Design a protein around this ligand. Structure first.
Ligand SMILES: [Zn+2]
Lengths: 85, 231
């Protein structure tokens, strides 16, 4: 049921044709400019300022979090009974 | 040993358009047909002027022979000067009025010039192929310019040549690029690229100074509502 719902949502997301549009009321970086988008946005709040492009900043290698891994599993009933005894 | 004073040449060309005439068939007056055709372009009943060089040669104007020889010898350059003088004549006729919007490029230009509002700025921002929207063509009838296909050789490169022949093959009409327009993603600026010849290379990175200094990495996307095409 998860797979069917996810695939139907994704294939219903797509739209056919294109165009380009101006958001009147939002300023651009360059002077006297309005914001410009190049996909058929449903509503102005769906706009994202192309944050999907921008590469994320990383911490240096000395200061990243780290886990410690123990190989941990739910063993069979036979092994669990022997270990309990 | 070259002449590049374009203003004097423009003065000569405008004097030709002002002073060529033909008498009316009833004798009632004079027709000034070239400036009538210029006003037809100004009111957008027309798209091209066809100029006869022999009329320039036989006009009653000083330096007429020199102007005709210069047109014939460097025709690819004098087309620009004719377009500039006709544009100045159109603005002198039109005054503070506006020419009618008829197509999407006209609508884009009329909307965007007043968005820019809301001559140095105009001429720096827009290329002249986009500012001027009409055609100029030349003709000759004197037998000095009559040649065959066989005779057109290295002395004729850049010159005006006339000939007569039979058509073997012809293609159908296609759209040809004249000016491309690109818009930036991040900073919403525009780039205008005129095209000459049978090839062009599109630019990739945005040239606007604020975008470059901020290192915003905005791509350029081409737009065909602002771009110019020709048959
Ligand atoms: Zn940019």
């Amino acid at each position: 049921e998860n797979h069917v719902v996810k695939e139907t949502q994704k294939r219903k997301s797509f739209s056919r044709f294109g165009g380009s549009y101006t958001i009147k009321g939002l300023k651009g970086i360059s002077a006297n400019s309005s914001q410009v988008v190049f996909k058929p946005i449903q509503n102005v709040e769906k706009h994202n300022f192309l944050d999907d492009r921008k590469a994320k900043k990383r911490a240096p290698r000395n200061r990243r979090p780290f886990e410690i891994d123990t190989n941990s599993h739910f063993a069979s009933s036979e092994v669990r009974g022997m270990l309990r005894d | 040993t070259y002449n590049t004073d374009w203003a004097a040449e423009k003065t000569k060309i405008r004097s030709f358009f002002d002073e060529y005439y033909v008498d009316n068939e009833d004798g009632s007056g004079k027709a000034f047909p070239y400036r009538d055709q210029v006003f037809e372009i100004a009111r957008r009943d027309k798209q091209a002027i066809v100029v006869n060089v022999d009329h320039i040669k036989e006009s009653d104007i000083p330096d007429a022979l020199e102007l005709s020889e210069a047109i014939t010898s460097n025709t690819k350059r004098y087309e620009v000067l004719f377009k500039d003088t006709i544009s100045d004549m159109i603005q002198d006729y039109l005054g503070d009025k506006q020419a009618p919007v008829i197509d999407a490029l006209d609508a884009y230009m009329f909307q965007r010039l007043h968005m820019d509002r809301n001559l140095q700025d105009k001429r720096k921002k827009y290329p002249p192929q986009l500012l001027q929207r009409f055609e100029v063509y030349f003709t000759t009838d004197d037998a000095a310019h009559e040649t065959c296909v066989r005779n057109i050789k290295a002395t004729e490169i850049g010159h005006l040549v006339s000939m007569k022949g039979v058509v073997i093959r012809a293609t159908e009409v296609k759209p040809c690029v004249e000016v491309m327009t690109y818009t930036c993603d991040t900073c919403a600026a525009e780039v205008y690229q005129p095209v000459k010849g049978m090839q062009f290379t599109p630019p990739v990175n945005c040239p606007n100074k604020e975008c470059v200094e901020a290192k915003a990495n905005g791509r350029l996307h081409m737009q065909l509502r602002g771009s110019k095409f020709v048959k």
